[PDB]
Amino acid sequence: NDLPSSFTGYFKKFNTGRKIISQEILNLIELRMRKGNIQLTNSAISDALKEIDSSVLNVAVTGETGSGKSSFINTLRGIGNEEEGAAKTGVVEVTMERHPYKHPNIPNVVFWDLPGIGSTNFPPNTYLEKMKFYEYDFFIIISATRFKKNDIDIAKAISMMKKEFYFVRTKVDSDITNEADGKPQTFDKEKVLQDIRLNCVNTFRENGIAEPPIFLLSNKNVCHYDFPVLMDKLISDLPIYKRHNFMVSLPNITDSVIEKKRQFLKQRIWLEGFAADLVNIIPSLTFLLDSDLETLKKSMKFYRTVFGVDETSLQRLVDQVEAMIKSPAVFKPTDEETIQERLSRYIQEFCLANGYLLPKNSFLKEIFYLKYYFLDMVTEDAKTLLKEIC
Amino acid sequence: AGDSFMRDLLKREEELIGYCREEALKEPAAMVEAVTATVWPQNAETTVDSLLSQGERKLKLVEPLRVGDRSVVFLVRDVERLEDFALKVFTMGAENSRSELERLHEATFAAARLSPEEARDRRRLLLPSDAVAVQSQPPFAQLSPGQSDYAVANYLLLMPAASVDLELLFRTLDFLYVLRSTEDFLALHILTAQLIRLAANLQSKGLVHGHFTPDNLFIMPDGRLMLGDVSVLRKVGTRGPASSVPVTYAPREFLNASTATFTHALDAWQLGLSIYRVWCLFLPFGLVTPGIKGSWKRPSLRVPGTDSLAFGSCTPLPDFVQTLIGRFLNFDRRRRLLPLEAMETPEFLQLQNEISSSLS
Ligand SMILES: Nc1nc2c(ncn2[C@@H]2O[C@H](COP(=O)(O)OP(=O)(O)O)[C@@H](O)[C@H]2O)c(=O)[nH]1
Ligand SMILES: Nc1ncnc2c1ncn2[C@@H]1O[C@H](COP(=O)(O)OP(=O)(O)O)[C@@H](O)[C@H]1O
Ligand SMILES: [Mg+2]
């Protein structure tokens, strides 16, 4: 019931391995807090958030021409293959140069479309050097249909360097369709997927390569097959400080992706709230400065964009779409109540349901309870729209 | 056997092969229907006379099997003999003019001398059982009732029916690549060894074929791989029209004159191409391979293109297979590996030993 204990204790409510700051940094903050130099504590937190925000993610995607590299990249960026900023087939093979594609909302997340080694004249090791293998956080081999010698030569070379890579078998929807059409009397969708997966595992084993993470998926049906488990695996392999930016960049493909995003953002709000310093007044009896109000509007706009319920995403789905969810209406003025009155009402709802999250007589500033409330509101909005999509 | 493995694989994938077989009949559906309606205009059985000594038979249509550039091949039944056959029916070009078909007949049935029972019991070359004509109509000349746009010659070739031709097998694998287990992939090893032994058989008899292509290479119901189109067989070193070699299967050296010398190196080249397709589905050097995804469009080796042998887009293949393909595909025809000699190389001995060990 002392404050440093309450601070650190919040993170222990979260799934292990699923925190946004390391134990080391957390211990550092707990310590500065017990000191009592509020500037020092504020700085340690601000620094951790700076490190989180400024982290750049570089994701390499290699594979044969037509294997689904650009489609994969577009899928992760939540961009249509025909939309603006979409990666397109043919270009990398023509140029034989890698091409970066930034996530449209989180420009610190970058996907690199690499030319197939077959489109170049480099032997495996020379290819990996020319493509700057060591600069990527993830090196993903994209493979459609069946193994090619190129796929294995690249993987073997990485194996030799005692390094690692991910293997993604795309177009499994086409495999399942062809099994169902060509062999209906023996067709079993689950059995087909397992058969292909085991061919992947065993193919690596037979080439003396340590079994890599293997994902069977379809760029045309992202909420199914192994796309969500690929996302889980990728986040879990990252150094802790890189996880936030990648997590928030993820397409809102399932409830589970959406919810995990919420959990991450709750920890961020907790850090932001402690960086701003706790007060000795209940938020249900406070109000907001104009600066606070502007911070809140921007936080709402960010949450909405992250969860794909921003106005632009709604338009790509308008008054009829807005009407389905709650967040678009929050800052719409009425003679019925002021924005200060609406926001105090939200605090009442939030704090009545959840309490003040702290030992007695200590509170976060009102704006942070409001961020929590908006975060909950946006994630529900996200799930509501996803169901319409689905 | 060897053969037994391949027999079991075809049986396992019988439904899939059947699906792909039917799918390939869809585009030429008009041709297939017109030819069917010419040969079986009213009754399910057509009475035919042998152009040799086999006398009279009644052929019942079971189903269309395959379409070629100049023909339709049907599965038929001689109920009285309790025997099924492939029956090849020729459309009239002129690609199959009356004189060309008379010449095809003589070359086809002379080929055994170049003994029918013995060549039949040895099971390397797929020989026709008979050549027949619909009763009461002159042989070779157009068959009535004629159907618009698809004139059919009254000359029908009766053969053992293969389970599948390698072209259809490759098209089937390109649709759904059913090889997944380590055991499954022995199919590619077995076909590699079988193709080499088939070509070696030709070499041992001092004969050249020059049409050693997947649509003329047949897996029989017992799993044996056989080579068809026996009418093209020639003694090694003889001269003939170069145009008789399919252009995408012709070595560069065969594209320079209208007349060519037929050498064992010709078949060794085509052997290399067929082994490459076993592991790759498409032809090497960017050569156009109709019906196969990933194919490029190079019309022949005389058109400028990629002349280095590339394996990167193939199924992963053993180094000893790569070596053999590379030697069969030597552009220097005088240094090109021949199949009898290939069977003595460390690479072939390794291929044979690992197949025998895997099957033991
Ligand atoms: N059915 C299906 N088609 C796909 C999938 N991924 C890609 N494609 C299609 O396959 C073709 C090649 O994909 P693309 O991303 O352009 O290949 P790239 O050359 O590696 O960039 C395009 O027509 C895509 O629409 C998939 O998972 N399933
Ligand atoms: N005995 C047979 N059994 C099964 N299929 C056959 C047989 N003979 C030919 N075929 C198939 O029929 C098709 C046409 O035969 P082909 O000899 O290539 O004629 P074309 O000269 O018209 O191309 C080919 O796909 C071939 O594999
Ligand atoms: Mg043919």
Curated annotation (Swiss-Prot), chain A:
A GO BP entry is: regulation of autophagy
Superkingdom, natural source: Eukaryota
Indicate whether Thylakoid appears among the record's keywords: no
(Microbial infection) Phosphothreonine PTM sites in chain numbering: 89, 95
The kind of enzyme this is, by top-level EC class, is hydrolase
List cystine links. Answer: 223-390
Protein known as: Interferon-inducible GTPase 1
